[PDB]
Design a protein around this nucleic acid. Structure first.
Lengths: 95, 97, 78, 103, 97, 80, 105, 91
DNA sequence: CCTTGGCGGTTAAAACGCGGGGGACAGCGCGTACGTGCGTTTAAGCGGTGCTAGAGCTGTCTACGACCAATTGAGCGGCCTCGGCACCGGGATTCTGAT
DNA sequence: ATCAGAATCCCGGTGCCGAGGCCGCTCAATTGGTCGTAGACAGCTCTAGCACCGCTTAAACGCACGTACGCGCTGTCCCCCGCGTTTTAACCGCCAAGG
């Protein structure tokens, strides 16, 4: 039996965080998995173009930041950059 | 007795903006897709979920193209659609040369 | 053939589009544009399955062909 | 897990694996997947938060995809993002040109 | 004199500008507008001229396409006078809101 | 300042004529200016962001090329 | 024939393309026939479009191809126009589109 | 930083051998060639990752050229590619 | 005793039909916004000239990353429960038109 | 306006079914340890981006003025809405089949 992938449990937990009293359909969970897929793919493609228009092959978080604020529209993007940056601080401040 | 026209159509517009269920039912749509699929390589089997995907994408596609065509006709100082309206909308989007 | 598309089907397409009043030649014009749409879609879908060396077109290939025409659709594992 | 060590919810190393097998670069840094995972996390938080409000509207408990399409089509920046995006069982805006309303 | 009730002027200049090759918007005011928009997100930025020429090229092409579909909207409107909501309908159909 | 008003009516005329437009209404020009402005807003925002990660205070033609390829309004001619 | 270009009888450098594939982060490994195949496709595309370029430039008694020639030759094609639909050429312009409602009748 | 100029000259002399060209025409041509190369190559990389094949042979390139270019161009291109494969494989 | 196949009941979205009514289309007449010229004013363009951030370009050392054995428990495949919606009749209400 | 009456909304009701809990696995994240060069950084050099101005001139601006498409209106005529009437695509059932 080949082991297949999903992101269902993760975003499921996130949904339980932001709304404890809320159910969901299974197809919509698949939709959100496809959503994460699509956003990830556009970001990664912008990362590869970041590489080739920078002639470098290392990926750091700075490239991810500039990729996100290339793709996403402004206000949403800046809030997301804030969330990611504070997470970078909280992780890399410890181990 | 007889009702006055235009009313029932808009009432069922308000009804048909509600359920996202598929408008074209399955079997004839499947036959049409199979018949067009016949002329590339002979007798290919199909996943039914793929058929539902084709059905979904086709119906949403046509609904949106209708929306733009309808707004074209509203701009055209009229209420009824015309085939030239579809030609205008397609000429803006760029399917045909 | 192509005449399996009923008149009230395209009428329902106007209704979910929200369109009120309908002309005549609309029907055959609709069937034609739908045909060309499905032609390009299923052509490159069968191209995907040709590379797959397999005798059933995957739903995955349908999804990726929609991506190839810039018509990205979620929902069915894409 | 680094996600817990980042205090977040998405698995880092799965993403670190997928970055490798995507031919995305030659080498992969340390905390870039953490940043990307947090981006994903806030995105899905915002989306499903509006979806939760959409369920609050209809007084539904389980999310139907119609809620998702509506919450996409309401917000500005999200709809400009997902302009070329459609969803099965989507539907559209309940919208009527009032010039076609009768008099 | 030879005042000429109209018709040859506009269409003749269309013939000239479609025999033409080069730009129409002249350089300096467009450049200064570019720098004013540029002075809004990061200050004090320098530029090479070829970037500005590409910007001018794609700008005029963008507006040419707007004018073409606007023209066909007007022809469908049974008019030759353009209107603003023509352009609004054209950008509505182009998905560039 | 006010270079948005540096857009001249005869330039809009010339663009209409190569655009093939015959008859010009008067309520068109500032609408045209606004659309052109929003266009160039998104363009130069993305180009400057590409140059932000470039760590060079000067934007190149290549940058604008890459940014407009990102919008899908992709233009040839200058390499990129 | 020492060079693979002479071994293919073509005009493009293949090992160029193979290094492009290697310095592409495209696949992990690249076979031997794919770069030759793709370069041949490229060479056909060049010759095919340059045919329409040659006729379109010859339309105006000019030995040199200008960008207006290239845009004309593209828009006068059908497959190339649906190819280049999102595509714009520098110094291009568009076709003569004089509507029939405009000529003095 | 190489452009494809003499390649264009040799194609041109093989087709319309009495024909000049401007500089920026060559620039647009090389822009074109790079765009086409990038689109095909990325689509082939999509073929790999959508098909879990750890490398790419010529068959992937054939089906990708099918996926990009429409009919007549596609069939003539497949013909030219297989003919090149044939003559390179013979020697 | 087993396949499996044309024949046939069940019925509901599917094709006619009329009539007409309200909406599409030609004309009518004006009229007031707008082409066109002409003279007048202006700013853009071009050619030099200083001219300097600053990109463009080159050694270098490191640390972070590539990569390799244990380990291990989280993530995953299977099972199992219940209350969440899907529809159904009640009944009430609100459009809609003839009045 | 205004009543009658279609059309729709909306409230228990029950049922059933899949969402979600749950639980025992095992394989990739981890943990730790070992080379290594890519890049962060220091610094050199010359280009080019910038600013400025003088001279030239063609290009814009304002107005004079007719005028003619845009438009509001009109009559009209016709042909889609819709409701009614068959009517045929389509589906579960199954008895002969032979075989």
């Amino acid at each position: 039996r080949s082991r297949k992938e999903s992101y269902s449990i993760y975003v499921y937990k996130v949904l339980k965080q932001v709304h404890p009293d809320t159910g969901i359909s299974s197809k919509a969970m698949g939709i959100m998995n496809s959503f994460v897929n699509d956003i990830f793919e556009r970001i990664a493609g912008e990362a590869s173009r970041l590489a080739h228009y920078n002639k470098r092959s290392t990926i750091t978080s700075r490239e991810i930041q500039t990729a996100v604020r290339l793709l996403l529209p402004g206000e949403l993007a800046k809030h997301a950059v804030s969330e990611g940056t504070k997470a970078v601080t909280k992780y890399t401040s410890a181990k | 007795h007889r009702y006055r026209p235009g009313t029932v159509a808009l009432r069922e517009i308000r009804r048909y903006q509600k359920s996202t269920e598929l408008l074209i039912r399955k079997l004839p749509f499947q036959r049409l897709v199979r018949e067009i699929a016949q002329d590339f390589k002979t007798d290919l089997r199909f996943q039914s979920a793929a058929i539902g995907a084709l059905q979904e994408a086709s119906e949403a596609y046509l609904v949106g193209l209708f929306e733009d065509t309808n707004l074209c006709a509203i701009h055209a100082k009229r209420v009824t659609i015309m085939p030239k309206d579809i030609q205008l909308a397609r000429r803006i989007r760029g399917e045909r040369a | 053939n192509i005449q399996g598309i009923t008149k009230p089907a395209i009428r329902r397409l106007a209704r979910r589009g929200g369109v009120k009043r309908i002309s005549g030649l609309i029907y055959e014009e609709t069937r034609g544009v739908l045909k060309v749409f499905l032609e390009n879609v299923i052509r490159d879908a069968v191209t995907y399955t040709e590379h797959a060396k397999r005798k059933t077109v995957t739903a995955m290939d349908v999804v990726y062909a929609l991506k190839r025409q810039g018509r990205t659709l979620y929902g069915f594992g894409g | 897990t680094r996600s817990s060590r980042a205090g977040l919810q998405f698995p880092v190393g799965r993403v670190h694996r997928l970055l490798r097998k995507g031919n995305y670069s030659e080498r992969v840094g340390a905390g870039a997947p953490v940043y990307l995972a947090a981006v994903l996390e806030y995105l899905t938080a915002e989306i499903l938060e509006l979806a939760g409000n959409a369920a609050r509207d209809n007084k539904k408990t389980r999310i139907i995809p119609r809620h998702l399409q509506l919450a996409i089509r309401n917000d500005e920046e999200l709809n400009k993002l997902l302009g070329r995006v459609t969803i099965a069982q989507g539907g559209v805006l309940p919208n009527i040109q009032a010039v076609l309303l009768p008099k």
